[PDB]
């Protein structure tokens, strides 16, 4: 109305910049964002190398390195804090809003003491780190997927040593099913927010496409469940 | 000297004023007779004529004057039929012989009421066979009669009705009037009369014409038969239209296309008559004679009575002959014609005997009197177009010969009908919708044949039972053929072909349904028996002697029922009546009576109900079995889900269709469309469900 | 001895901090109040300002 021609030009410039930014934000939201971590690269098991092994998702070491790929018309962004140290709360609070967090636990370390300190074992460190990273005020609704890495070595080693070396409270018979059930129960009993936060125990076995396929299934499940909760069906 | 009395209707008022042309003929005949020396030896014929104006009272007064005067009349001559009746009835008391030259009344043939009566004029019944032949020629059977309350017309109508009953023509209306035809014409219009016979005199004919115009009783729907001896100009109006409120133009348009019949009454030969003169020699005479009397023979062919003019000449000649032929004076010299008295019945008897036996050839033809009598004269048929009379032909009653000259000028070129008749119009399915159904049906047949060829080696489709699918395809193709024979109806077939196509329908549709639903039911039942009924115990797949049994048994039962109900009760076609409707073309005065062909018989309804009940039973059983084998899956008969959906759709469609068809059978288009579309959708959906996944699995 | 060197460096830093001629807090507070009083008028947030001179009106 009373605005001059330069006012109209400024309005048009603002409109086009806002439209471009809105489009960029729209196409940036569909790319899922994950965060893999564990007990200090102990349970890595070259899981990041599975995408390179399959190579279907084809085309400095400072701070955090990002893994970028696509699976079934779905862009995947995967971030890892490799030996960040520093202070956890400095950067943890900025990683909220991720689709899920990948917690990797080395199953071959069930009879091997932590090299960082001999006082406490590796599974204990994984347990306290899971407690610290699952119960934050930020990750209160973020689902967690769990990787049981190098379980073949665990199966080949359980027949030679008892499980009381680090789990005295379990009197169950030494069996693969019983040991796996006890480990799952111990890990999932730490979920104080089980009401609204879901946990997945999609393990890893060899260099097969099943791991990434079930990872895709898990993230799809997380997205669908989040939408269902948003619309009032959950 | 031989003197006789004469009565001639000259003046007017009403009746048949033929005296104006029959009195000069009488004068010519008397001149010819008195000029012959050998006819009456030493005698001359003297006529004491008078004018009666066709009035019975004036005729009676004239007869009284003649019979109470000095000269004793030997015999009497009379004209008009009405005057002739009274004169001839009364003359029996005076022993007088009466010769009626122009009386056509059929009631004058009664020898008890009119003993001493002779007639040169033919009876009016001569026109009746001509009228009936005219009706037969143009195909008329419902004819009305409008007559004037006179003995001549009453007798003519009685004879005409007797001959119509003996011929097969129905008399619709018998209106009669005295002088005013207004009420009679109104009743003619009320009774819906199309062909009307008119028997009047000229004045009553003019009044009837006025009523015709004022009541629209003419045009392209009404044919009027008139009398032929009216004046040519005065038949519509020429003389006294002052009394009539209508104008000459109205009479001319009203009198258009009406047929008249009349006897010839002129010698239609060349031989000389008794007077040694031809008929044309007497036509040259009586034309000059009428010219000297003021009648304009140059344009109008003489006044009324010209057609009957030879009859008066012949009557006078016959009177002279009978007076000469007596010769009873030779037998008894005392008795002589000069000494005749009204009391003497002997000379009267001799005169009657001579009159009865006379026979000669006159200007009117052969004059035989009561000796021969009938000698039915040749009649002439004419029609009035544009105010003029055009001859249409001649009819000889004795020889039954009608020489027809094709000059009829019916309004619009079509003969008017005696009534408004209904037309039986067959209602059929619309051609575009029939073609729409037939194209889809042909596509279905082609698809069925292609899939049959495809199925009839590769274990992808050979894993499932292929023979049941092929039999299903047989049945569905037969069902589209059934739709075709249902649609072709009675438009493309004759009435004698409808039972055959209807039986072919009832047979081939039933066999196709039996085949298709038997394949489906056998498949689902085999699935149930080989997986669910066998339960945990297995090591036995499906095979023949079990699957073929049910379908073959159902087909055999269907065929047996079809044969039994066809032999016990064949199929005939019944026509369902629909109500009368006016045609699009209003020119044709015929109603439309639409109808729709159907199929039924005495036991057809019960057998149809029984076959429908059996079909419903098998449909419900198959639907229940398909529901019960929902989750059941077989390695060999893997096609169970598709067959289940097809069975459910088939049951639903048949149960929704058969009531609806039984309801809407009245509307042929909607019923055919519904049945054809239901069968087409069911059939095509079954093909898709059973076979399309197999084809796409083979391709991929 | 990394710990000994670190302790020596921390002690040297503390000694250098002790080598600062710290003044009385009264003078610092006086400077603060004088600056706040002298700059009170030139603070747009403190002094209410009319819309005409205000860029946002």
């Amino acid at each position: 109305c009373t605005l001059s021609a330069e006012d109209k030009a400024a309005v048009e410039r603002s409109k086009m910049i806002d439209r471009n930014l809105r489009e960029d934000g729209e196409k940036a939201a569909r790319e899922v964002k994950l965060l893999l971590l564990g007990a200090g690269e102990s349970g890595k098991n070259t899981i990041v190398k599975q995408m390179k092994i399959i190579h279907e998702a084809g085309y400095k070491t400072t701070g955090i390195v990002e893994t970028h790929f696509t699976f079934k018309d779905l862009h995947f962004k995967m971030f890892d804090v490799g030996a960040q140290r520093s202070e956890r709360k400095k950067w943890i609070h900025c990683f909220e809003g991720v689709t899920a967090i990948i917690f990797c636990v080395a199953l071959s370390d069930y009879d091997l003491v932590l090299a960082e300190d001999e006082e406490m074992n590796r599974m204990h460190a994984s347990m306290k780190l899971f407690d610290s990273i699952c119960n934050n005020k930020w990750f209160t609704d973020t689902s967690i997927i769990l990787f049981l890495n190098k379980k073949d070595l665990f199966e080949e080693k359980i027949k030679k040593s008892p499980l009381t070396i680090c789990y005295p409270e379990y009197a169950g018979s030494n069996t693969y099913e019983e040991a796996a059930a006890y480990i799952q129960c111990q890990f999932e009993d730490l979920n104080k927010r089980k009401d609204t936060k879901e946990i997945y125990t999609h393990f890893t076995c060899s260099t097969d496409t099943k791991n990434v396929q079930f990872v895709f299934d898990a993230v799809t499940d997380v997205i669908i469940k989040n939408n269902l909760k948003d619309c009032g069906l959950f | 000297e031989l003197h006789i009395g004469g009565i001639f209707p000259i003046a007017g008022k009403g009746g048949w004023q033929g005296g104006q042309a029959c009195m000069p003929a009488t004068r010519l005949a008397l001149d010819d007779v008195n000029k012959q020396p050998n006819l009456l030896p030493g005698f001359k014929l003297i006529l004491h004529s008078n004018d009666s104006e066709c009035e019975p009272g004036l005729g009676a007064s004239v007869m009284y004057n003649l019979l109470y005067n000095k000269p004793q009349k030997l015999m009497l001559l009379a004209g008009c039929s009405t005057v002739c009746t009274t004169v001839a009835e009364a003359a029996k008391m005076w022993n007088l012989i009466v010769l009626c030259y122009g009386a056509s009344s059929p009631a004058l043939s009664d020898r008890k009421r009119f003993p001493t009566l002779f007639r040169t004029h033919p009876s009016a019944t001569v026109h009746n066979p001509t009228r009936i032949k005219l009706m037969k020629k143009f195909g008329w059977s419902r004819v009305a009669i409008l007559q004037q309350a006179e003995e001549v017309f009453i007798s003519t109508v009685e004879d005409l009705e007797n001959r119509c009953m003996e011929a097969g023509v129905e008399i619709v209306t018998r209106q009669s009037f005295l002088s005013d035809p207004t009420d009679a014409v109104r009743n003619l219009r009320r009774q819906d009369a199309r062909i009307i016979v008119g028997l009047f005199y000229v004045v009553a004919a003019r009044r009837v014409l006025c009523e015709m115009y004022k009541q629209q009783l003419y045009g392209r729907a009404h044919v009027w038969f008139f009398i032929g001896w009216y004046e040519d100009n005065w038949y519509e109006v020429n003389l006294k239209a002052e009394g009539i409120t209508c104008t000459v133009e109205q009479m001319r348009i009203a009198a258009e296309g009406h047929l008249t019949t009349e006897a010839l009454m002129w010698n239609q030969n060349n031989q000389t008559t008794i007077s040694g003169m031809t008929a044309e020699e007497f036509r040259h005479r009586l034309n000059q004679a009428l010219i000297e009397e003021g009648y304009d023979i140059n344009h109008d062919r003489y006044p009324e009575g010209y057609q009957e003019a030879p009859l008066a000449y012949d009557a006078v000649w016959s009177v002279a002959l009978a007076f000469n032929k007596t010769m009873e004076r030779l037998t008894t010299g005392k008795k002589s014609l000069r000494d005749f008295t009204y009391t003497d019945k002997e000379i009267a008897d001799e005169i009657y005997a001579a009159m009865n036996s006379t026979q000669f050839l006159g200007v009117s033809g052969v004059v035989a009197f009561s000796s021969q009598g009938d000698r039915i004269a040749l009649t002439q048929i004419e029609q009035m177009i544009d105010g003029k009379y055009e001859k249409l032909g001649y009819y000889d009653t004795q020889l039954d010969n009608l020489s027809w000259l094709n000059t009829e000028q019916w309004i619009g070129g079509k003969v008017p009908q005696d009534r408004t008749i209904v037309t039986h119009v067959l209602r059929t399915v619309s051609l575009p919708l029939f073609v729409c159904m037939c194209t889809i049906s042909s596509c279905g047949i082609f698809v069925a044949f292609a899939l049959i060829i495809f199925n009839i080696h590769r274990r992808v489709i050979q894993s499932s039972h292929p023979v049941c699918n092929t039999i299903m395809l047989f049945g569905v193709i037969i069902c589209l053929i059934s739709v075709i024979l249902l649609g072709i109806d009675g438009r493309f077939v004759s009435p004698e072909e409808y039972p055959k196509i209807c039986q072919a329908r009832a047979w081939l549709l039933s066999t196709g349904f039996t085949l298709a639903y038997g394949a489906m039911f056998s498949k689902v039942w085999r699935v149930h028996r080989f997986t669910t009924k066998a339960k945990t115990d297995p090591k036995k797949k499906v095979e023949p002697w079990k699957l073929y049994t049910m379908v073959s048994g159902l087909l055999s039962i269907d065929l047996v029922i079809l044969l039994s109900w066809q032999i016990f009760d064949p199929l005939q076609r019944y026509l369902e009546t629909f109500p009368l409707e006016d045609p699009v073309s209003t020119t044709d005065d015929i109603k439309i009576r639409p109808e729709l062909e159907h199929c039924e018989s005495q036991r057809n309804s019960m057998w149809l109900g029984l076959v429908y009940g059996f079909k419903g039973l098998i449909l419900v059983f198959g639907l229940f079995l398909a529901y019960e084998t929902r989750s059941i899956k077989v390695k060999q008969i893997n096609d169970s889900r598709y067959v289940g959906m097809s069975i459910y759709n088939v049951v639903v469609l048949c149960l929704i269709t058969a009531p609806v068809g039984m309801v809407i059978a009245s509307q042929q288009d909607a019923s055919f469309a519904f049945v054809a579309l239901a069968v087409i959708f069911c059939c095509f959906l079954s093909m898709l469900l059973i076979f399309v996944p197999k084809v796409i699995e083979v391709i991929r | 001895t990394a710990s000994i060197a670190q302790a020596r460096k921390l002690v040297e830093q503390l000694k250098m901090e002790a080598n600062i001629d710290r003044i009385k807090v009264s003078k610092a507070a006086a400077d603060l109040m004088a600056y706040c009083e002298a700059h009170a008028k030139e603070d747009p947030l403190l002094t209410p300002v009319p819309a005409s001179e205000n860029p946002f009106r």
């Binding site: - | - | 250098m16 002790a18 009264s26 507070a29 706040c36 700059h39």
Partner: protein
Amino acid sequence: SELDQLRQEAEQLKNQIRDARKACADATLSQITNNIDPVGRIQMRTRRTLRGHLAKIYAMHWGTDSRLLVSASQDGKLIIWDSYTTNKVHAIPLRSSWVMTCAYAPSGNYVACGGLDNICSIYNLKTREGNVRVSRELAGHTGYLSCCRFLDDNQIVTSSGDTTCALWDIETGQQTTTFTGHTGDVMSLSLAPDTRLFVSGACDASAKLWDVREGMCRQTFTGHESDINAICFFPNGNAFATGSDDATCRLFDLRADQELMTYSHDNIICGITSVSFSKSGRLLLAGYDDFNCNVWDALKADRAGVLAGHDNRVSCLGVTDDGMAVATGSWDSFLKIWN
């Protein structure tokens, strides 16, 4: 022996400096200005609503022009705004979305940024070519980047997550001066209105007075109950505010070397995230995790007024050169302008 002697010497120095600090606190700050009346309640109307960001804003810097503000967030967009007409000027994409620090050159030609990749990147904004570009990359210390400030062009002081502040020369791509000695993780930095001193807190509940040219902390300020989150400076260069998670702003003084006042409230339990002063130094702008920000009178140690409008943490704060307006950067992807 050596360790015991060093510990004894350090303890003696600490006791001596504590005694000197206690002696220096002759007059109480709350008592000197107790006779000075407050200025009442000041209304802060939301003049401009600046929207367009699609992620939580972690950094914001004003400009000497008082109209160009750089907003940084994890959506990958350093956007230069304009408070006058709410018009964006140049949205800058980034190679890494994980950024938390943004800086503005005093001349307005350059714009700096940095994040979790341990890289401090500077972009040339004013040039003949319209499109912006990465003027220089200064990937430095191993630890994560927490704050950065440029005294002028070609020079920018930067923090790190390995407890090592540094001064960067943009043209040579090297650090000409180092700052080592921080016990805790460095969080926030600010510069004096000169090229001699800059303040720097750390994750040890303390603040230090470094010198750019020398590289040794002149004065150390302690007294916080939690690690530092955001620090400020007085307009002239003798004082500086300091706020942490203890929900208490601890003003300090350069010459006095001691805490002056305390800005805290009973019902506030939210950690501070952004503290800035005003032109006169009477007001003190502070933002907490309460989703609200409140103004503290730097003289009477009392709250001046409240300010709301953000639905999440207020993580950014800034004051223009002239001080007409103050802005905030929250976690709800919005920005606001007051006064």
